[PDB]
Amino acid sequence: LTFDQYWAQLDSAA
Amino acid sequence: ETLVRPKPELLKLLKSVGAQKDTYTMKEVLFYLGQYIMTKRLYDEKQQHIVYCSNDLLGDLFGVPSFSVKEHRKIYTMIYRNLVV
Numbered sequence: 001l002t003f004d005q006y007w008a009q010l011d012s013a014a
Numbered sequence: 015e016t017l018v019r020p021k022p023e024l025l026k027l028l029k030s031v032g033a034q035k036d037t038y039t040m041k042e043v044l045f046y047l048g049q050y051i052m053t054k055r056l057y058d059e060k061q062q063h064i065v066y067c068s069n070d071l072l073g074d075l076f077g078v079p080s081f082s083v084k085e086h087r088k089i090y091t092m093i094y095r096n097l098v099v
């Protein structure tokens with residue numbers, strides 16, 4: 001994916 | 015949402031991309047950290063989950079030359095080593 005799409009997945013764990 | 019406290023080195027890192035406080039939610043910490051990595055272009059252009067941080071403050075704070083954004087548990091561990099207990 002783009003960097004932004006991988007990085008978004010961490011917001012979920014928060 | 016729980017407020018957490020960065021240690022001095024992480025705090026300077028977040029304040030370099032506009033952060034204005036001494037405490038943050040974890041979603042805020044993850045926001046400013048993402049803006050840092052992407053602003054300084056540390057991610058691999060071709061393989062965009064992999065971050066190269068060998069010549070960066072971030073490499074010193076996290077104790078690695080690179081990491082993968084897929085490793086969620088490991089990113090959280092590395093961030094919590096840099097927060098006040």
Ligand SMILES: *N(C)CC(=O)NCc1cccc(CNC(=O)CN(*)C)c1
Binds near residue numbers: 007010044045
């Ligand atoms: N990536 C497309 C570029 C970029 O600058 N992204 C910043 C951005 C856009 C939308 C939302 C956020 C923050 N929300 C999250 O999902 C991350 N948790 C804080 C960041």
